[PDB]
Write a protein that binds this ligand. Sequence first.
Ligand SMILES: Cc1oc(-c2ccc(F)cc2)nc1CCOc1cc2ccccc2cn1
Ligand SMILES: [Mg+2]
Ligand SMILES: [Zn+2]
Length: 313
Amino acid sequence: GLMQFTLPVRLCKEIELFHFDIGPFENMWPGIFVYMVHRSCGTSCFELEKLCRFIMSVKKNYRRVPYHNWKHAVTVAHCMYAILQNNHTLFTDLERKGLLIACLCHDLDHRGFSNSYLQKFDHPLAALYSTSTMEQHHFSQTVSILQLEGHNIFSTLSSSEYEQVLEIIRKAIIATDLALYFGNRKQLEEMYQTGSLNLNNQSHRDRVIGLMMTACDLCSVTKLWPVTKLTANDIYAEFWAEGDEMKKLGIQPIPMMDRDKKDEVPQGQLGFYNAVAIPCYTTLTQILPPTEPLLKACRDNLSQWEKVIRGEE
Ligand SMILES: Cc1oc(-c2ccc(F)cc2)nc1CCOc1cc2ccccc2cn1
Ligand SMILES: [Mg+2]
Ligand SMILES: [Zn+2]
């Protein structure tokens, strides 16, 4: 109970910033996450014995794919930590608990293939869950792990508090399906503009948590240019493997996934920043003004991709 986690000075200071990179030492990522729970949530939120056992089982159920791996899980949880810490008073005790766990779990057992590829392959998961296929599987794996002996990090919550937090995690994980993002942000856009956005309305909170989940999930675009740039390689390495698998089913993949069309990546990152990322962090900044650094960092990386196109790198 008197057992804090602490971090070296450089990490203690940088972990508070949105552009923090968790670094290449896998063995420090559990301690980084627990540090974030303790400052975000409290030293009492979770039984340390149970939290540590939960983290390690989550880690074990992420696969060794180039991008949708254990490092992505912790990176997405750190972005959520940064948002929560800069918006201290807006979120309930249960949301602070739920959301860091949701982020850590949001891509559990990902294979590096999109929902589309599961549907065209005719993967068993695409019969079990017709939309948001991987995301319903991620939530499914989360409940699985919560139910292993010794892993119930929520066992101090009441019957109905337990149901509220698992319902926060479910919606948070479903929202990471980028197909649901577009409409969700349009609704938040109109609600914010017509002045009807109300955070006492549970359906409005749900929408806002959804957008945070998209913001944390895409946070690779909000780091310093060399982090953003090297992560884009991991992202495309999965896309090109999927493209290859599409060719093996006799389907020309979209250019984004075709490794013979690498030259179009810079122009594809512009489309992605303007169609997805910039709008996401704009609407997020409108609703939670302290998340502006994510918008500023995202715009800086858009400008770095423009420079790559103009052959100045
Ligand atoms: C998946 C995708 O969707 C689109 C896209 C989607 C809608 C649209 F109107 C135009 C482009 N381009 C991509 C290719 C690049 O996709 C991504 C996904 C990322 C996720 C996290 C951090 C960085 C990322 C960079 N590029
Ligand atoms: Mg996902
Ligand atoms: Zn993700």
